[PDB]
Amino acid sequence: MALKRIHKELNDLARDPPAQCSAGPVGDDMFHWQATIMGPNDSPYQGGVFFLTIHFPTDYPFKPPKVAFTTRIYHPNINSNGSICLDILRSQWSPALTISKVLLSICSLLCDPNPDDPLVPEIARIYKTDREKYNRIAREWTQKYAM
Amino acid sequence: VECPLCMEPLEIDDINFFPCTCGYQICRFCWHRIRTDENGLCPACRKPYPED
Ligand SMILES: [Zn+2]
Ligand SMILES: [Zn+2]
């Protein structure tokens, strides 16, 4: 009926994944997408293996999916606890939007993050104050968390 | 043909069934859902559907 979208997009972004965002395996639940993202070449973010557990509700293609990063990555817009909020997913959104667009939004946020702080401002404040201050730790953290 | 609303197939007579003239066609078993939990908006416009 409508659940097929979860598996369809899962396999879709598994065989031929878009830019940086890749899918494949699932989490503890079918509505718990365990996607993996890769860092860009311009910003201090490497590929490695960063998991992002996206939780879809009973209205996945109608209600904004709750994205919760599994792998703690040092990103000004990605809190250490996994708090990652998408700009286009803020204040509702247009009913049915492919996960590809949602994931691509994170990719665009990887190339030079946003100074707008989310849950914990620390990561955004350091970026807003000085780039190098966050650049040095970003590339270090992404490496130490690259298993 | 599969509606991007649920990644599920469509009907022959559903191909001409579009609640919006923005080229966005979707099977009846998809549009009805938008009018159930959502405000009945266009998945690529955020605007309310002219459909009943
Ligand atoms: Zn459908
Ligand atoms: Zn429209």
Side-chain angles (χ1 to χ4, degrees):
Chain A
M1 203 291 181
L3 175 66
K4 169 121 152 297
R5 200 188 211 241
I6 288 86
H7 233 215
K8 195 97 206 289
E9 301 200 86
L10 179 85
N11 179 260
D12 201 275
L13 279 75
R15 328 154 311 231
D16 51 291
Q20 291 166 266
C21 21
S22 332
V26 286
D28 76 283
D29 182 73
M30 276 298 170
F31 292 98
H32 222 183
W33 246 47
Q34 198 191 270
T36 319
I37 197 165
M38 298 165 64
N41 82 282
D42 61 282
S43 302
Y45 291 103
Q46 68 161 270
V49 52
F50 300 115
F51 292 118
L52 47 135
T53 17
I54 325 166
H55 189 222
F56 311 145
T58 321
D59 328 276
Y60 165 48
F62 295 103
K63 293 295 148 295
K66 292 88 183 76
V67 198
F69 248 83
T70 341
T71 317
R72 180 175 296 207
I73 180 174
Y74 222 99
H75 185 245
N77 311 105
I78 295 175
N79 288 126
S80 333
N81 66 282
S83 285
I84 163 70
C85 355
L86 279 313
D87 190 80
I88 58 160
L89 263 71
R90 194 191 307 108
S91 308
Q92 257 186 273
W93 70 338
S94 299
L97 179 68
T98 175
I99 196 67
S100 323
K101 196 75 175 80
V102 183
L103 293 186
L104 283 170
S105 301
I106 313 174
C107 306
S108 315
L109 195 51
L110 239 43
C111 291
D112 191 40
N114 206 280
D116 194 46
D117 55 272
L119 174 70
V120 206
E122 52 170 41
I123 42 182
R125 296 294 151 102
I126 56 174
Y127 160 79
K128 172 104 170 179
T129 38
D130 182 80
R131 307 304 248 258
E132 275 305 281
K133 179 167 53 180
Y134 119 86
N135 276 337
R136 63 185 78 121
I137 181 67
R139 52 182 57 112
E140 179 54 38
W141 198 271
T142 39
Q143 181 175 88
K144 282 300 190 293
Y145 262 71
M147 286 83 168
Chain B
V1 284
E2 286 178 304
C3 46
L5 240 77
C6 65
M7 272 48 173
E8 285 267 60
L10 311 160
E11 266 303 305
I12 302 299
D13 78 291
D14 238 358
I15 298 182
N16 67 87
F17 179 73
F18 37 86
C20 205
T21 1
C22 41
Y24 212 96
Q25 164 258 96
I26 34 174
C27 62
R28 248 149 294 169
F29 299 138
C30 276
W31 156 75
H32 206 264
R33 255 227 58 152
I34 327 173
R35 209 194 66 185
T36 311
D37 71 280
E38 198 29 68
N39 291 266
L41 317 165
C42 218
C45 318
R46 184 75 165 257
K47 310 284 178 296
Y49 271 146
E51 232 46 80
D52 166 70

Short mmCIF file of all heavy atoms in Angstrom, two decimals, chain A residues 31-56:
data_model
loop_
_atom_site.label_atom_id
_atom_site.label_comp_id
_atom_site.label_asym_id
_atom_site.label_seq_id
_atom_site.Cartn_x
_atom_site.Cartn_y
_atom_site.Cartn_z
N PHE A 31 11.00 0.91 10.01
CA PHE A 31 10.85 2.35 9.92
C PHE A 31 12.10 3.03 10.46
O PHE A 31 12.14 4.25 10.62
CB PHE A 31 9.62 2.82 10.70
CG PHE A 31 8.31 2.38 10.11
CD1 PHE A 31 7.64 1.28 10.61
CD2 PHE A 31 7.74 3.09 9.06
CE1 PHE A 31 6.43 0.88 10.07
CE2 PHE A 31 6.53 2.70 8.52
CZ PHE A 31 5.87 1.59 9.02
N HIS A 32 13.11 2.24 10.76
CA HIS A 32 14.36 2.76 11.27
C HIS A 32 15.46 2.55 10.24
O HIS A 32 16.18 1.56 10.28
CB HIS A 32 14.73 2.08 12.60
CG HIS A 32 15.28 3.04 13.62
ND1 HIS A 32 15.74 2.64 14.85
CD2 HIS A 32 15.42 4.38 13.58
CE1 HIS A 32 16.14 3.71 15.53
NE2 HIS A 32 15.96 4.77 14.78
N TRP A 33 15.56 3.49 9.32
CA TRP A 33 16.54 3.44 8.26
C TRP A 33 17.95 3.60 8.80
O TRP A 33 18.23 4.54 9.54
CB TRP A 33 16.27 4.56 7.26
CG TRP A 33 15.86 4.10 5.90
CD1 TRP A 33 14.92 3.15 5.60
CD2 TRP A 33 16.37 4.57 4.65
NE1 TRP A 33 14.81 3.02 4.24
CE2 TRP A 33 15.69 3.88 3.63
CE3 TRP A 33 17.33 5.52 4.30
CZ2 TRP A 33 15.95 4.11 2.29
CZ3 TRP A 33 17.58 5.75 2.96
CH2 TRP A 33 16.89 5.04 1.97
N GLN A 34 18.84 2.68 8.45
CA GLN A 34 20.22 2.75 8.90
C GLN A 34 21.11 3.10 7.71
O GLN A 34 21.93 2.30 7.26
CB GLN A 34 20.66 1.42 9.53
CG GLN A 34 21.91 1.56 10.39
CD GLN A 34 22.50 0.22 10.78
OE1 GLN A 34 22.15 -0.34 11.82
NE2 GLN A 34 23.40 -0.30 9.96
N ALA A 35 20.92 4.30 7.19
CA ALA A 35 21.67 4.77 6.04
C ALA A 35 23.08 5.20 6.43
O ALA A 35 23.37 5.39 7.61
CB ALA A 35 20.94 5.92 5.36
N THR A 36 23.93 5.33 5.44
CA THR A 36 25.31 5.74 5.65
C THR A 36 25.64 6.93 4.75
O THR A 36 25.25 6.97 3.58
CB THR A 36 26.27 4.57 5.34
OG1 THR A 36 25.73 3.36 5.87
CG2 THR A 36 27.64 4.82 5.95
N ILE A 37 26.34 7.91 5.30
CA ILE A 37 26.70 9.09 4.53
C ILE A 37 28.21 9.25 4.43
O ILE A 37 28.95 8.75 5.28
CB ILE A 37 26.07 10.37 5.14
CG1 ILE A 37 26.09 11.52 4.12
CG2 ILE A 37 26.78 10.77 6.42
CD1 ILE A 37 25.18 12.67 4.49
N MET A 38 28.66 9.92 3.38
CA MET A 38 30.08 10.15 3.16
C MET A 38 30.37 11.64 3.15
O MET A 38 29.56 12.43 2.66
CB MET A 38 30.52 9.53 1.83
CG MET A 38 30.35 8.02 1.77
SD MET A 38 30.45 7.37 0.09
CE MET A 38 32.14 7.79 -0.34
N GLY A 39 31.51 12.03 3.69
CA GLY A 39 31.88 13.43 3.72
C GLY A 39 32.38 13.93 2.38
O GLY A 39 32.84 13.13 1.55
N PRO A 40 32.31 15.25 2.13
CA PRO A 40 32.76 15.84 0.86
C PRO A 40 34.28 15.99 0.79
O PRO A 40 35.00 15.59 1.70
CB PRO A 40 32.08 17.21 0.88
CG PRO A 40 31.99 17.56 2.32
CD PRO A 40 31.77 16.26 3.05
N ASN A 41 34.76 16.58 -0.30
CA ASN A 41 36.20 16.78 -0.48
C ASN A 41 36.62 18.20 -0.11
O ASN A 41 37.79 18.47 0.12
CB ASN A 41 36.61 16.47 -1.93
CG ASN A 41 36.37 17.63 -2.87
OD1 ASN A 41 35.24 17.87 -3.29
ND2 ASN A 41 37.42 18.35 -3.21
N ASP A 42 35.65 19.11 -0.06
CA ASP A 42 35.93 20.50 0.26
C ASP A 42 35.97 20.72 1.77
O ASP A 42 36.80 21.48 2.27
CB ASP A 42 34.86 21.41 -0.36
CG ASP A 42 33.47 21.10 0.14
OD1 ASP A 42 32.88 20.11 -0.32
OD2 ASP A 42 32.98 21.85 1.02
N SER A 43 35.09 20.05 2.49
CA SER A 43 35.02 20.18 3.93
C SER A 43 35.81 19.05 4.60
O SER A 43 36.07 18.02 3.97
CB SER A 43 33.56 20.17 4.38
OG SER A 43 32.83 21.22 3.75
N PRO A 44 36.20 19.22 5.87
CA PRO A 44 36.98 18.22 6.62
C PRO A 44 36.16 17.00 7.04
O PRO A 44 36.17 16.60 8.20
CB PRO A 44 37.46 18.99 7.84
CG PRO A 44 36.42 20.03 8.06
CD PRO A 44 35.93 20.42 6.69
N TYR A 45 35.46 16.41 6.09
CA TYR A 45 34.64 15.24 6.35
C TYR A 45 35.00 14.13 5.39
O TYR A 45 35.02 14.32 4.18
CB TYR A 45 33.15 15.58 6.22
CG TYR A 45 32.65 16.50 7.31
CD1 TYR A 45 32.42 17.85 7.07
CD2 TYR A 45 32.40 16.01 8.59
CE1 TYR A 45 31.97 18.68 8.06
CE2 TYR A 45 31.94 16.84 9.59
CZ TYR A 45 31.72 18.17 9.32
OH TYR A 45 31.27 19.00 10.32
N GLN A 46 35.31 12.97 5.94
CA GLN A 46 35.69 11.82 5.12
C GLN A 46 34.50 10.89 4.95
O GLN A 46 33.45 11.09 5.55
CB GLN A 46 36.85 11.07 5.77
CG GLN A 46 36.48 10.37 7.07
CD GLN A 46 37.47 9.28 7.44
OE1 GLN A 46 37.32 8.13 7.05
NE2 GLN A 46 38.49 9.65 8.19
N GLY A 47 34.68 9.87 4.11
CA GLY A 47 33.62 8.91 3.89
C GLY A 47 33.46 7.98 5.07
O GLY A 47 32.52 8.13 5.86
N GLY A 48 34.39 7.05 5.21
CA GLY A 48 34.35 6.10 6.30
C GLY A 48 33.05 5.34 6.37
O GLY A 48 32.68 4.64 5.42
N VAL A 49 32.35 5.48 7.48
CA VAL A 49 31.08 4.80 7.67
C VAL A 49 30.29 5.46 8.80
O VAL A 49 30.41 5.11 9.98
CB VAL A 49 31.29 3.29 7.94
CG1 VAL A 49 32.29 3.06 9.06
CG2 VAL A 49 29.97 2.59 8.24
N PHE A 50 29.49 6.46 8.44
CA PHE A 50 28.67 7.17 9.41
C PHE A 50 27.20 6.79 9.22
O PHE A 50 26.60 7.08 8.19
CB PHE A 50 28.85 8.68 9.25
CG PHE A 50 30.26 9.14 9.47
CD1 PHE A 50 30.99 9.70 8.43
CD2 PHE A 50 30.87 9.01 10.71
CE1 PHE A 50 32.30 10.11 8.63
CE2 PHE A 50 32.17 9.42 10.92
CZ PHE A 50 32.89 9.97 9.87
N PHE A 51 26.65 6.11 10.22
CA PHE A 51 25.27 5.66 10.17
C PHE A 51 24.32 6.72 10.71
O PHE A 51 24.61 7.40 11.70
CB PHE A 51 25.10 4.38 10.99
CG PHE A 51 25.78 3.17 10.40
CD1 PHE A 51 26.79 2.53 11.09
CD2 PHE A 51 25.41 2.68 9.16
CE1 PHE A 51 27.42 1.41 10.56
CE2 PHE A 51 26.02 1.56 8.63
CZ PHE A 51 27.03 0.93 9.33
N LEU A 52 23.18 6.84 10.05
CA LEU A 52 22.15 7.78 10.45
C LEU A 52 20.81 7.06 10.50
O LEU A 52 20.21 6.75 9.47
CB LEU A 52 22.09 8.98 9.49
CG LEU A 52 22.10 8.64 8.00
CD1 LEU A 52 21.05 9.44 7.27
CD2 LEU A 52 23.48 8.90 7.41
N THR A 53 20.35 6.77 11.71
CA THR A 53 19.09 6.07 11.91
C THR A 53 17.90 7.01 11.77
O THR A 53 17.59 7.78 12.68
CB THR A 53 19.06 5.38 13.28
OG1 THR A 53 20.08 5.94 14.12
CG2 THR A 53 19.29 3.88 13.14
N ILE A 54 17.24 6.95 10.63
CA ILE A 54 16.07 7.77 10.37
C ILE A 54 14.81 7.03 10.79
O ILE A 54 14.54 5.93 10.29
CB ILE A 54 15.96 8.16 8.88
CG1 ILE A 54 17.35 8.36 8.27
CG2 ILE A 54 15.12 9.42 8.73
CD1 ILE A 54 17.34 8.42 6.76
N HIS A 55 14.05 7.60 11.70
CA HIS A 55 12.83 6.96 12.17
C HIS A 55 11.61 7.52 11.44
O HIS A 55 11.30 8.71 11.54
CB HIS A 55 12.66 7.14 13.68
CG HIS A 55 11.52 6.33 14.24
ND1 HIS A 55 10.65 6.81 15.19
CD2 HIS A 55 11.13 5.06 13.98
CE1 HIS A 55 9.76 5.87 15.48
NE2 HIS A 55 10.03 4.80 14.76
N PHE A 56 10.94 6.64 10.72
CA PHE A 56 9.74 7.01 9.99
C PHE A 56 8.52 6.64 10.82
O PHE A 56 8.51 5.60 11.48
CB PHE A 56 9.66 6.28 8.65
CG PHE A 56 10.91 6.33 7.82
CD1 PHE A 56 11.27 5.24 7.04
CD2 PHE A 56 11.71 7.46 7.80
CE1 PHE A 56 12.41 5.28 6.27
CE2 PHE A 56 12.85 7.50 7.03
CZ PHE A 56 13.20 6.40 6.26
#
